[PDB]
Amino acid sequence: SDIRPYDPNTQRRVVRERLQALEIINERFARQFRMGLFNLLRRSPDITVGAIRIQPYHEFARNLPVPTNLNLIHLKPLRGTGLVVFSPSLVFIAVDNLFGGDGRFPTKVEGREFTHTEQRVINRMLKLALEGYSDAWKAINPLEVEYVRSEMQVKFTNITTSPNDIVVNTPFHVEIGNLTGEFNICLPFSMIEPLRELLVNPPLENSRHEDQNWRDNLVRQVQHSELELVANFADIPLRLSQILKLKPGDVLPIEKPDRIIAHVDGVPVLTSQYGTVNGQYALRVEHLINP
Amino acid sequence: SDIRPYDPNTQRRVVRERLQALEIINERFARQFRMGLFNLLRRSPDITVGAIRIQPYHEFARNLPVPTNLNLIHLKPLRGTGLVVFSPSLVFIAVDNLFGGDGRFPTKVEGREFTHTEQRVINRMLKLALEGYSDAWKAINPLEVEYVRSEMQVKFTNITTSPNDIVVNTPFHVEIGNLTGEFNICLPFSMIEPLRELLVNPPLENSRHEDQNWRDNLVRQVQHSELELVANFADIPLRLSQILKLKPGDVLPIEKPDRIIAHVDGVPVLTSQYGTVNGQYALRVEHLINP
Amino acid sequence: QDIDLIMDIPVKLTVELGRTRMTIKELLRLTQGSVVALDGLAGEPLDILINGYLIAQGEVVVVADKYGVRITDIITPSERMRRLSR
Amino acid sequence: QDIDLIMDIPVKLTVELGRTRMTIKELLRLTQGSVVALDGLAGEPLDILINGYLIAQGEVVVVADKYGVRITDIITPSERMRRLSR
Amino acid sequence: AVFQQLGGGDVSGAMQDIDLIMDIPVKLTVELGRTRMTIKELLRLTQGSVVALDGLAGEPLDILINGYLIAQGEVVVVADKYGVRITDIITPSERMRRLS
Amino acid sequence: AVFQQLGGGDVSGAMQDIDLIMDIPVKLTVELGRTRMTIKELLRLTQGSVVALDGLAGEPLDILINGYLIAQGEVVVVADKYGVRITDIITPSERMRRLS
Amino acid sequence: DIDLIMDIPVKLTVELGRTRMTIKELLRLTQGSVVALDGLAGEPLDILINGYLIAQGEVVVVADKYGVRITDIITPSERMRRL
Amino acid sequence: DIDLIMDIPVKLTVELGRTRMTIKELLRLTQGSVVALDGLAGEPLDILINGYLIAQGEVVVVADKYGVRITDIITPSERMRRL
């Protein structure tokens, strides 16, 4: 028997789920970003998509280097705030290539911050990155990507209510010539959760008309399914002691039921007034309990 | 006695069916594609039609090389999405012939992707391929072929709801001079299924008027066939225990039948009110159960 | 050879108005209000069946404002054999 | 095996009008004022339950201008077993 | 007197369409041959005896649905399973030729 | 005479929407196979015996909600846990094919 | 009298999975969606007669046709626990 | 008669914290706000049956599922002090 003391703040919540739809969106975005980078840098980059990592937010934060450009982005209409992380190496490579450099010298990063010119270069790159990501998402679910803010430290973002929240991280590796760099795209699981059934199964070559026809027929098929409806006349609170002495012939007082709740497996569906019709216990339906 | 444990995801569904109508459509399309290729490449290709393979989709996917141009096509009005697979060898041969090459050097493929010019050449070839396929199908069943999307990897298509779905694959081998290549046409069995009786028997030299006259006479011949109609008055649910103690003289309570279902071999055909006419148990037909 | 094992299994019992055999022609021209007969005289006991297998015979009876089947007899196999034979 | 330990724990008792089994179709077209029946004849004792477990049977009685359940009997397990069986 | 006496229900009759009755099972049966024979030879029959059929060998076989002749086909063997190949729906003239 | 006699409540009927009843638990059940068999072989059954099912091996399995057939799926194994993959909602024609 | 109910046909089923779901969940299912089953792999499948559970047994395939081996017949002691 | 109430289901809960607050305080709480608990770390969690306290025990996790070890059952002497 395994029995160990409960320790809070321990990484005990494990939620592993393959995300095929994200697995293809990543390659589509990588292809779009590669040509965007070719268009900008006038060079030939190769982007390798890494394995999607489903990890608590503080793991993602601690693995990041300091300083690193973080780009808070809004993936409307999905409520939340995603993050696009550009490594110092990648921005160094881009600035070197733009400003008359054939990347001859090795990239040197020693905690140096980002100037206004570097920030503008990163904004120019991030415009292409966001356009590519939006186009890639457009195939499955049309989303609009808005860049709201850029930061350099990790403690300024806090896109997760708690550091133990679970986020989805995709690291890409971009190589230009001999130089290499990496950049990540992190989405909080709260944003993805309404689209889990969409992001879980691999996409199929269908149409929106076919999809809506599918659930329509399924909805119609569901209607022909019998349910069990239970009407509760009264709910009287008695102690255990009363129940054991309880014996036939006793009278347990109850209050006036103005309305009768009808529930299916616990969930209330109807409130209706009791009655007798055709020798049967009947209910006069008064109100369907809408949410 | 052969008895082995049930293992899921094993290839246990075998559906072998000769498809003569596809067997002739393949040659018609091959002839059309050969002259189209002669018209384009200004050379003399020979296309050999391979044996049609009826195989699960993941067998077709795994046999394919990487990368390979995949062309998702819509064979409307048939619901589904077919695939036209152009091998790297064939597109290499076509590009070499178009751009000042007598195919002197051997074709070399090392996982190289397809550029925009190569994609445009493949689109030009696929236009002829789709025209030839539509013309070949036009003889048996008039279909319109639409090219919707092209991809390079295998995981982007997913034209089968599940990888174990069954698809029909036709590989053709195209030889130009000493150089050779191949290309496949894959159709999910869901698209073919409504046309199975058409695609199974070899075509006959008849006319649409003759075909419609045929089923018309057959329909008229079918009408003179007696059926067995059974009317169900009531359906009472009793336990086995009641059935054994059940003995003559007992009364089993039944509910009001508002309408009486009339079924042939299980399938309900009529609902009609019971009655007595001419000393016979009669039914006043109220509604034919249309689907 | 257990007995209590299947002593509680439920079965569904059906009762018929009657047989009749009628072709596709008349079935297609049946309209609302049309009347079709059956092979049984009004008065014979209806056949009770389980899983499409003959089990009993009985007719409907009106007691007060309620309905039920009054079983007449239980068919022995010998009778079942002549049922199939004729 | 203590007795006074749980001698005072409270339980909540519920009473039903009746069972009924009705599909999504009729449930969605139920409107205000619509009447739906139950599986019990008007007069049988209602079933008293605790935590969804059968405990008793009794009906409502009017004494003066007040209401209460008059318990008829206590179900032994044997009865409970036939309740599940049928 | 529970059953209510129905009468005068001969309103009209008109074929509606053949899809109202579509998914109704049919009993299809292919017939090898026929032969008119009396009880005389009938009991003379023992195990291993051979009864000649009126149908000539190799002629198209008869196809019936619920015992009603509709078409004439030809027998073929596909994957070790017996199969008939429908050739032609019979004509009213051959129907009566069959009757006589 | 405490209960008040309700009658004439058949006002009308019209589907409202499928979200009034949404968060109601459904009893989903996947079915491996079927077989029509009589009590004859039923008691003949002992421990370790094998009962053949009418369903061919590898065919799509049936999915029911509250015992009502809605869809046909395919069985898959994910992380050592059994799972069905919904393939197609059944048609009224196959529903009746199932009935017969 | 045993002879009468010793010949009657009955419908037998064996269920492979059992899951409880809301309608948000059922509607969310699309084509190709995978639905997890409460039942672990290898546990005895329920065997039902006209919807009535009588036995438990493992899944086995014989001669390319689905089948089930009757591991045990459940005594009504487990029926209380079935609910 | 003991047999009747020896089988009935009942709902069991264990509460980890207890705090008294006004509404200014409750409304002020936002997303991510941390609410302190009067209960010190390591003190026995209350165990309630249908909202009725019967026992006290420590928190322990077994097989990745929450649990509690019954340290003691409170005699009604402590109930006066519970209020």
Side-chain angles (χ1 to χ4, degrees), chain A residues 1-10 15-37 39-41 43-68 70-107 111-151 153-238 240-243 245-253 255-269 271-283 285-291, chain B residues 1-10 15-37 39-41 43-68 70-107 111-151 153-238 240-243 245-253 255-269 271-283 285-291, chain C residues 1-3 5-26 28-81 83-85, chain D residues 1-3 5-26 28-81 83-85, chain E residues 1-20 22-23 25-88 90-100, chain F residues 1-20 22-23 25-88 90-100, chain G residues 1-4 6-22 24-80 82-83, chain H residues 1-4 6-22 24-80 82-83:
Chain A
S1 64
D2 70 89
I3 166 174
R4 66 184 182 277
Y6 150 76
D7 191 6
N9 68 267
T10 58
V15 178
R16 55 182 181 86
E17 189 75 16
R18 179 70 176 289
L19 286 190
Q20 312 268 353
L22 256 187
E23 284 276 14
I24 78 147
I25 286 171
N26 288 168
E27 295 302 320
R28 262 167 166 83
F29 156 75
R31 163 156 272 95
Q32 216 86 352
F33 197 44
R34 165 203 293 240
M35 295 297 103
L37 276 206
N39 186 25
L40 185 150
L41 277 97
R43 290 292 308 270
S44 166
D46 57 332
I47 316 183
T48 79
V49 176
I52 288 172
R53 304 173 190 170
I54 296 100
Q55 53 200 10
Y57 173 79
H58 61 78
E59 208 73 26
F60 169 58
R62 75 205 328 180
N63 291 323
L64 270 203
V66 50
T68 299
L70 277 66
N71 305 278
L72 303 173
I73 51 153
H74 277 164
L75 292 183
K76 312 198 254 315
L78 296 199
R79 293 182 183 174
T81 290
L83 177 56
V84 172
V85 175
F86 279 140
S87 297
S89 323
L90 209 161
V91 309
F92 195 102
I93 291 168
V95 168
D96 181 23
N97 274 243
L98 294 174
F99 285 96
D102 289 345
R104 292 181 66 172
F105 315 98
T107 185
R112 181 177 65 83
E113 293 177 350
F114 294 167
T115 57
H116 280 276
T117 64
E118 291 214 348
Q119 175 68 41
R120 207 78 61 82
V121 167
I122 294 169
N123 288 340
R124 174 100 60 70
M125 272 177 31
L126 175 90
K127 167 194 193 42
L128 306 176
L130 294 203
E131 268 166 356
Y133 207 67
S134 189
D135 299 348
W137 262 95
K138 184 180 68 65
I140 287 172
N141 193 24
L143 300 176
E144 57 184 341
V145 190
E146 276 89 336
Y147 156 64
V148 305
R149 180 145 61 74
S150 149
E151 295 302 320
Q153 294 300 320
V154 185
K155 57 198 167 51
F156 296 161
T157 58
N158 283 334
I159 67 105
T160 61
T161 56
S162 89
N164 269 358
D165 279 88
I166 187 79
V167 304
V168 173
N169 186 359
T170 304
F172 312 80
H173 300 347
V174 184
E175 276 82 5
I176 294 169
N178 44 318
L179 310 161
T180 189
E182 60 186 340
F183 79 96
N184 312 42
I185 293 185
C186 163
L187 298 193
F189 212 76
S190 300
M191 297 180 27
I192 271 171
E193 250 304 312
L195 307 188
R196 181 179 180 274
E197 80 278 8
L198 195 33
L199 281 160
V200 158
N201 44 9
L204 295 174
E205 287 324 286
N206 264 25
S207 95
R208 320 302 290 284
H209 177 66
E210 295 166 82
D211 289 345
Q212 186 173 355
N213 189 30
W214 163 275
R215 181 177 65 83
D216 184 1
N217 303 309
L218 177 63
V219 175
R220 308 184 305 93
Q221 290 334 287
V222 160
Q223 285 159 16
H224 313 134
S225 70
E226 65 183 1
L227 294 174
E228 183 178 2
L229 187 59
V230 182
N232 285 342
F233 177 80
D235 191 21
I236 65 197
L238 295 174
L240 191 147
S241 64
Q242 321 195 33
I243 313 308
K245 62 180 68 180
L246 189 147
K247 293 179 179 179
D250 305 359
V251 174
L252 302 159
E255 202 32 70
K256 293 179 179 179
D258 289 345
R259 293 178 179 83
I260 303 301
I261 294 169
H263 66 106
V264 172
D265 214 322
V267 170
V269 186
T271 59
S272 53
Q273 290 177 323
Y274 45 106
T276 43
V277 63
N278 293 338
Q280 277 326 89
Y281 282 126
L283 313 98
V285 175
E286 257 206 48
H287 181 16
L288 279 158
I289 319 172
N290 43 25
Chain B
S1 64
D2 70 89
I3 166 174
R4 66 184 182 277
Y6 150 76
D7 191 6
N9 68 267
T10 58
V15 178
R16 55 182 181 86
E17 189 75 16
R18 179 70 176 289
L19 286 190
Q20 312 268 353
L22 256 187
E23 284 276 14
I24 78 147
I25 286 171
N26 288 168
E27 295 302 320
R28 262 167 166 83
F29 156 75
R31 163 156 272 95
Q32 216 86 353
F33 197 44
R34 165 203 293 240
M35 295 297 103
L37 276 206
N39 186 25
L40 185 150
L41 277 97
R43 290 292 308 270
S44 166
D46 57 332
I47 316 183
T48 79
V49 175
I52 288 172
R53 304 173 190 170
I54 296 100
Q55 53 200 10
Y57 173 79
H58 61 78
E59 208 73 26
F60 169 58
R62 75 205 328 180
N63 291 323
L64 270 203
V66 50
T68 299
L70 277 66
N71 305 278
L72 303 173
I73 51 153
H74 277 164
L75 292 183
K76 312 198 254 315
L78 296 199
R79 293 182 183 174
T81 290
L83 177 56
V84 172
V85 175
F86 279 140
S87 297
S89 323
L90 209 161
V91 309
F92 195 102
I93 291 168
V95 168
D96 181 23
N97 274 243
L98 294 174
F99 285 96
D102 289 345
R104 292 181 66 172
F105 315 98
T107 185
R112 181 177 65 83
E113 293 177 350
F114 294 167
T115 57
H116 280 276
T117 64
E118 291 214 348
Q119 175 68 41
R120 207 78 61 82
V121 167
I122 294 169
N123 288 340
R124 174 100 60 70
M125 272 177 31
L126 175 90
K127 167 194 193 42
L128 306 176
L130 294 203
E131 268 166 356
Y133 207 67
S134 189
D135 299 348
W137 262 95
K138 184 180 68 65
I140 287 172
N141 193 24
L143 300 176
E144 57 184 341
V145 190
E146 276 89 336
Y147 156 64
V148 305
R149 180 145 61 74
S150 148
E151 295 302 320
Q153 294 300 320
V154 185
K155 57 198 167 51
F156 296 161
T157 58
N158 283 334
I159 67 105
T160 61
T161 56
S162 89
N164 269 358
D165 279 88
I166 187 79
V167 304
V168 173
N169 186 359
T170 304
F172 312 80
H173 300 347
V174 184
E175 276 82 5
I176 294 169
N178 44 318
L179 309 161
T180 189
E182 60 186 340
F183 79 96
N184 312 42
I185 293 185
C186 163
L187 298 193
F189 212 76
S190 300
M191 297 180 27
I192 271 171
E193 250 303 312
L195 307 188
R196 181 179 180 274
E197 80 278 8
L198 195 32
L199 281 160
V200 158
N201 44 9
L204 295 174
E205 287 324 286
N206 264 25
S207 95
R208 320 302 290 284
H209 177 66
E210 295 166 82
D211 289 345
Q212 186 173 355
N213 189 30
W214 163 275
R215 181 177 65 83
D216 184 1
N217 303 309
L218 177 63
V219 175
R220 308 184 305 93
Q221 290 334 287
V222 160
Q223 285 159 16
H224 313 134
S225 70
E226 65 183 1
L227 294 174
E228 183 178 2
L229 187 59
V230 182
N232 285 342
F233 177 80
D235 191 21
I236 65 197
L238 295 174
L240 191 147
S241 64
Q242 321 195 33
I243 313 308
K245 62 180 68 180
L246 189 147
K247 293 179 179 179
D250 305 359
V251 174
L252 302 159
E255 202 32 70
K256 293 179 179 179
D258 289 345
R259 293 178 179 83
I260 303 301
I261 294 169
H263 66 106
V264 172
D265 214 322
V267 170
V269 186
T271 59
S272 53
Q273 290 177 324
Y274 45 106
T276 43
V277 63
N278 293 338
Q280 277 325 89
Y281 282 126
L283 313 98
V285 175
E286 257 206 48
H287 181 16
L288 279 158
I289 319 172
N290 43 25
Chain C
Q1 205 79 13
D2 308 341
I3 296 164
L5 159 49
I6 69 110
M7 179 67 181
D8 193 81
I9 294 169
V11 297
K12 291 174 65 175
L13 269 89
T14 175
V15 63
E16 295 177 339
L17 295 174
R19 281 331 199 198
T20 189
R21 293 182 183 174
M22 62 174 282
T23 61
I24 294 169
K25 183 178 179 180
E26 296 85 357
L28 295 176
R29 293 182 183 174
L30 274 184
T31 53
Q32 185 173 355
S34 58
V35 48
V36 48
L38 289 172
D39 295 343
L41 289 158
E44 293 179 353
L46 308 181
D47 289 345
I48 303 301
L49 282 102
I50 301 178
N51 272 54
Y53 176 77
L54 164 61
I55 192 69
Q57 290 180 336
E59 71 281 5
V60 61
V61 291
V62 63
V63 185
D65 59 356
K66 296 292 184 289
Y67 295 92
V69 301
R70 180 182 293 176
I71 303 301
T72 56
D73 80 271
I74 289 306
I75 311 95
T76 62
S78 62
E79 182 65 26
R80 186 170 294 106
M81 294 300 293
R83 298 294 296 163
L84 314 172
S85 85
Chain D
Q1 205 79 13
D2 308 341
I3 296 164
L5 159 49
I6 69 110
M7 179 67 181
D8 193 81
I9 294 169
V11 297
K12 291 174 65 175
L13 269 89
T14 175
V15 63
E16 295 177 339
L17 295 174
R19 281 331 199 198
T20 190
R21 293 182 183 174
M22 62 174 282
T23 61
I24 294 169
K25 183 178 179 180
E26 296 85 357
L28 295 176
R29 293 182 183 174
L30 274 184
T31 53
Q32 185 173 355
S34 58
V35 48
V36 48
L38 289 172
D39 295 343
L41 289 158
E44 293 179 353
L46 308 181
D47 289 345
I48 303 301
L49 282 102
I50 301 178
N51 272 54
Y53 176 77
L54 164 61
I55 192 70
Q57 290 180 336
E59 71 281 5
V60 61
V61 291
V62 63
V63 185
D65 59 356
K66 296 292 184 289
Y67 295 92
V69 301
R70 180 182 293 176
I71 303 301
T72 56
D73 80 271
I74 289 306
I75 311 95
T76 62
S78 62
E79 182 65 26
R80 186 170 294 106
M81 294 300 293
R83 298 294 296 163
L84 314 172
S85 85
Chain E
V2 175
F3 297 97
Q4 166 303 329
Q5 195 291 330
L6 278 172
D10 189 37
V11 198
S12 46
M15 180 171 174
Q16 293 176 335
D17 185 295
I18 200 43
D19 311 1
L20 295 104
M22 183 176 282
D23 289 345
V26 175
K27 183 178 179 180
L28 182 131
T29 187
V30 86
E31 184 178 2
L32 170 65
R34 293 181 295 103
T35 189
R36 151 71 41 81
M37 176 178 73
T38 166
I39 277 179
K40 284 290 183 217
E41 293 83 3
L42 191 44
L43 295 174
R44 293 182 183 174
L45 298 170
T46 88
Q47 312 324 287
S49 152
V50 164
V51 174
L53 295 161
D54 294 358
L56 184 68
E59 291 316 90
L61 272 68
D62 289 345
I63 286 175
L64 309 114
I65 46 142
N66 284 29
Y68 176 77
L69 177 63
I70 46 144
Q72 245 167 6
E74 183 178 2
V75 49
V76 75
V77 279
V78 295
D80 289 345
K81 190 55 126 181
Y82 267 7
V84 77
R85 163 197 287 122
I86 272 183
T87 66
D88 36 21
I90 86 172
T91 59
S93 87
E94 182 178 301
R95 179 170 294 107
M96 294 183 284
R97 201 281 311 291
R98 202 61 53 76
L99 200 155
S100 91
Chain F
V2 175
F3 297 97
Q4 166 303 329
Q5 195 292 330
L6 278 172
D10 189 37
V11 198
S12 46
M15 180 171 174
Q16 293 176 335
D17 185 295
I18 200 43
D19 311 1
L20 295 104
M22 183 176 282
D23 289 345
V26 175
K27 183 178 179 180
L28 182 131
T29 187
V30 86
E31 184 178 2
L32 170 65
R34 293 181 295 103
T35 189
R36 151 71 41 81
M37 176 178 73
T38 166
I39 277 179
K40 284 290 183 217
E41 293 83 3
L42 191 44
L43 295 174
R44 293 182 183 174
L45 298 170
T46 88
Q47 312 324 287
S49 152
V50 164
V51 174
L53 295 161
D54 294 358
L56 184 68
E59 291 316 90
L61 272 68
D62 289 345
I63 286 175
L64 309 114
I65 46 142
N66 284 29
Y68 176 77
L69 177 63
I70 46 144
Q72 245 167 6
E74 183 178 2
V75 49
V76 75
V77 279
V78 295
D80 289 345
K81 190 55 127 181
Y82 267 7
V84 77
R85 163 197 287 122
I86 272 183
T87 66
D88 36 21
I90 86 172
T91 59
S93 87
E94 182 178 301
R95 179 170 294 107
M96 294 183 284
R97 201 281 311 291
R98 202 61 53 76
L99 200 155
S100 91
Chain G
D1 63 358
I2 313 172
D3 289 345
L4 171 65
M6 178 171 174
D7 181 57
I8 294 149
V10 76
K11 182 68 180 295
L12 188 153
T13 53
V14 48
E15 293 179 353
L16 198 72
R18 294 179 66 188
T19 295
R20 273 171 44 67
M21 283 164 72
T22 77
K24 186 200 306 186
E25 300 190 57
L26 263 193
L27 268 48
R28 295 176 64 186
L29 311 180
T30 57
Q31 190 156 22
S33 302
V34 168
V35 172
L37 295 169
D38 290 345
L40 198 41
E43 317 312 322
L45 289 64
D46 300 344
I47 316 186
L48 284 83
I49 308 295
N50 297 19
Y52 177 71
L53 210 156
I54 87 185
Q56 293 177 7
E58 67 185 342
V59 51
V60 69
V61 47
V62 278
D64 289 345
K65 298 183 71 68
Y66 274 146
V68 48
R69 174 186 337 249
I70 294 169
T71 60
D72 75 295
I73 284 87
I74 60 110
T75 175
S77 295
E78 287 86 67
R79 213 163 251 106
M80 294 300 293
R82 183 65 65 185
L83 295 174
Chain H
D1 63 358
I2 313 172
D3 289 345
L4 170 65
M6 178 171 174
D7 181 57
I8 294 149
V10 76
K11 182 68 180 295
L12 188 153
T13 52
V14 48
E15 293 179 353
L16 198 72
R18 294 179 66 188
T19 295
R20 273 171 44 67
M21 283 164 72
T22 77
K24 186 200 306 186
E25 300 190 57
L26 263 193
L27 268 48
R28 295 176 64 186
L29 311 180
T30 57
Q31 190 156 22
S33 302
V34 168
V35 172
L37 295 169
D38 290 345
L40 198 41
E43 317 312 322
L45 289 64
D46 300 344
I47 316 186
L48 284 83
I49 308 295
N50 297 19
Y52 177 71
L53 210 156
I54 87 185
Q56 293 177 7
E58 67 185 342
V59 51
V60 69
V61 47
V62 278
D64 289 345
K65 298 183 71 68
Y66 274 146
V68 48
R69 174 186 337 249
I70 294 169
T71 60
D72 75 295
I73 284 87
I74 60 110
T75 175
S77 295
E78 287 86 67
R79 213 163 251 106
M80 294 300 293
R82 183 65 65 185
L83 295 174

